[PDB]
Design a protein around this ligand. Structure first.
Ligand SMILES: NS(=O)(=O)c1ccc(NC(=S)Nc2ccc(F)cc2)cc1
Ligand SMILES: [Zn+2]
Length: 258
């Protein structure tokens, strides 16, 4: 697999190796805020990150992932649309070459500068690899980023990026608290979807927060200094690593709020 985000290997090409790219529950999607309906059946959302144990940060050639110890129930997501318990495994971002693009989900066609994805797997399936084969295997918490004031809780991530510039580089990243990446409100939209990168598996319950977080121009500029390429290869800046909105088809987006 040589997929990426370029003209020659980007989202318009993915279907050839991954035919589910044209499936019935692909992500991301545009969230039409007028058509999303308030759902009183949604239980309260519970984000329990007090015991989260970060381990490492990795440039995987597509984004960077902050990885967690998921060998026990240390950082979990429950409630909302979810049945049972979902364990945090990693977070990553998608972002643009400029501040007017970068998010995967859109809100009434508005694109944000970036989007954070906190990835969790359903513990009833035992491991991540088994969970991704199930329709209710993952829950991804999506948070929009807009450019304005700096996000203090992001700065530790920004400051380590110089050490993982190129594909395959990693750095120890212990003691990072993901609580510092959340907005105040947990109001959200939810719908059934997919991974937004190959293999595009239709295993995700998406939970997209309504309230963006603010980050500074300086913070996002540092994301844009990363490289898709490996060390000693021609430089290709890691920007515009987002998939565009996909057809909603036979899905409804539910709102947790009135
Ligand atoms: N952008 S996203 O939808 O949140 C997203 C979240 C997670 C992943 N894949 C990961 S962590 N590894 C993986 C490896 C082998 C598989 F067969 C399936 C997934 C991709 C996209
Ligand atoms: Zn993602």
């Amino acid at each position: 697999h040589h997929w990426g985000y370029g003209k020659h290997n980007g989202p318009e090409h993915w279907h050839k190796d991954f035919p589910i790219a044209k499936g019935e529950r692909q992500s991301p999607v545009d969230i039409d805020t007028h058509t999303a309906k308030y759902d009183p059946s949604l239980k309260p959302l519970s984000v329990s990150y007090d015991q989260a144990t970060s381990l490492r940060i990795l440039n995987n050639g597509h984004a960077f992932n902050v990885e967690f110890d998921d060998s026990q129930d240390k950082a979990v997501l429950k409630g909302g649309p979810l049945d049972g318990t979902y364990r945090l495994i990693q977070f990553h971002f998608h972002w643009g070459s400029l501040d007017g693009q970068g998010s995967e989900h859109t809100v009434d066609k508005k694109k944000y500068a970036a989007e954070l994805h906190l990835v969790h797997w359903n513990t009833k399936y035992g491991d991540f690899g088994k969970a991704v084969q199930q329709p209710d295997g993952l829950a991804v918490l999506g948070i929009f980023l807009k450019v304005g004031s700096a996000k203090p809780g992001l700065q530790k991530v920004v400051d380590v990026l110089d050490s993982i510039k190129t594909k395959g580089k990693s750095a120890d990243f212990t003691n990072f608290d993901p609580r510092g990446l959340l907005p105040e409100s947990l109001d959200y939209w939810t719908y059934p979807g997919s991974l937004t990168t190959p293999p595009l598996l239709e295993c995700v319950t998406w939970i997209v927060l309504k309230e963006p977080i603010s980050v500074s121009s300086e913070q996002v500029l540092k994301f844009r200094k990363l490289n898709f390429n490996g060390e000693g290869e021609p430089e290709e800046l890691m920007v515009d690593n987002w998939r565009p909105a996909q057809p909603l088809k036979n899905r409804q987006i539910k709102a947790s709020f009135k």
